[PDB]
With several copies, the nearest count.
Chain A
Amino acid sequence: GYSDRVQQITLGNSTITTQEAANAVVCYAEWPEYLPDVDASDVNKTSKPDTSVCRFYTLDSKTWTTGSKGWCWKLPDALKDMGVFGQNMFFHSLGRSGYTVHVQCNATKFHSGCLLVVVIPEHQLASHEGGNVSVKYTFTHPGERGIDLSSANEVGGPVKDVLYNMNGTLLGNLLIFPHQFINLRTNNTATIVIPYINSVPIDSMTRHNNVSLMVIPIAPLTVPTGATPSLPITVTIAPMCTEFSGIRSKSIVPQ
């Protein structure tokens, strides 16, 4: 009796189990793969740390309240300080990778709520100042903490109206991107496998974030009478088929 609901994912020395999933998504039906000779340019032999960087890293938990707007992480940024994966990121000029994103959030058969979990390739954010104002480096590299869409604007930062996906497009159409929902009455986890998506074979992992992951409450949280009005949301990410190239000094980045 094998079910869509029960799953195990093992990468490196880390394993994940879930007994209430809803299948899993593989962005554009493509599993992550290494860089083949025919597509390469950079003549340097690449490094493949394998299990030392292709494992599950669990970010800090977020707190879902009746008022939460959503959150937004960015990869590889979000893992910039995670074990050997992070280290390699700064020591190399170039690098490419895919990931397996696992978002968790359990409640009860009495609760109600629906989170939209989506991956957006090249999620170029907009500045709340409008006109032609930029969005400073630090603000799109929140790191492990991520960006909290319900926090207030800050000078140099991006706009954070969930309604406009932080980029001038409507929330409702975010579904055209590989996504999955965490509907408390059905779900408790969302899983999305992301293959390397870019217009270049390999790229800089510090100055360019390939995709951003967003967890957005659509149907607000609802707890049973007299219960704590909050649920934690955890995000665990694991790189896969990671490749680094052009090793050297180690970047020193803004802030």
Chain B
Amino acid sequence: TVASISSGPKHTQKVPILTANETGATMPVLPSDSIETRTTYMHFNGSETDVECFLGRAACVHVTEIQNKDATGIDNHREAKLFNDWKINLSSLVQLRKKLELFTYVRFDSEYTILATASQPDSANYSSNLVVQAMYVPPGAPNPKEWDDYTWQSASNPSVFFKVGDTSRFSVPYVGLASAYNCFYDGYSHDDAETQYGITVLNHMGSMAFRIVNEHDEHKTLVKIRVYHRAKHVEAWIPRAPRALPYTSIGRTNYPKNTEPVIKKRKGDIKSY
């Protein structure tokens, strides 16, 4: 594959470097159209810039926390974090979000990796071997109310049990209701004067609960859970302007009031180097 062909002097009626950008087209002008060039080859395929590679690595998409402690006397297990849940979405942590939002529609399979790390902030005689249970609770499935509900039987909901300090791995097929995931949605759930706007009403993927199977020890243990996402078998459509201003909310395109200028200001002239 050639990168540049050999091109010498020129004196034509054919002016390639003269176009009209108001047509909306980016004419494919090459160096060899405005200067004398030598032959050179690519030696490059562009494999690393294929969308399958761009979204093909694990990125953290959520961090949450649960703890192993005496549940005796706790009225709201959820609030106490005896078990906690994550209302699934990929727009909570911005790094991956900006990437995905480089396109309008996106379709792919996902490979998740859940990392759980332990912590004993105050006096403990040892570090316990806790086993975590991560259960996917689809929309319509009964949500857990107590850390040891009947819901954790997970007869039909899928779920994994892994040691804290260890990692959990599994993959999920493209579960979109449409033919692709919407990164943006200029619409509502119905023609109503007050309902929510945005992909907020579209990406309703349920949530996944986390808990620690073991009963409590004398000391309290703090388990922090991190979910990582890796896309595979990627397909993307309609590229769009990259995000410039910082995010403020999951799903909305909203940006903070009184935000700092994102375009750098010149320390001088427009003639400055």
Contacts and interface: CB of A to CB of B under 8 A. Distances in A.
Chains A and B touch (C-beta atoms under 8 A apart): yes
Query: What secondary structure prevails in chain A residues at the interface with B?
Result: loop
Contacts of B190: 207
B24 A208 contact: no
A147 B240 CA distance: 21
Contact of A122 (B184, B239, B255): B184
A135 B195 CA distance: 9
Interface string B248-261: 11101111110000
Contacts of A134: 196-198, 200, 252
A182 B23 CA distance: 9
Interface in B215-273: 238-245, 247-250, 252-257, 262-263
Interface stretch (B143-151, B152-160, B164-172, B175-183): B175-183
Nearest to A139: B197
Contact of B187 (A4, A132, A209): A209
A88 interface: no
Contact of A23 (B25, B104, B185, B249): B25
Given A125-B253, A135-B197, A177-B240, A199 B178 contact: yes
B169 to A, nearest CB: 29
A181 interface: yes
Contacts of A210: 186
A204 B199 CA distance: 15
Contact of A137 (B188, B198, B200): B188
A121 B237 CA distance: 10
A200 interface: yes
A129 B190 CA distance: 23
Contacts of A126: 252-255
Give the interface centre of B183, B194, B254 by most chain A CB atoms within 10 Å: B254
Contacts of B122: none
The 9 closest A-B pairs by CB, nearest first: A208-B187, A169-B241, A181-B22, A173-B241, A254-B193, A132-B249, A180-B24, A122-B184, A199-B178
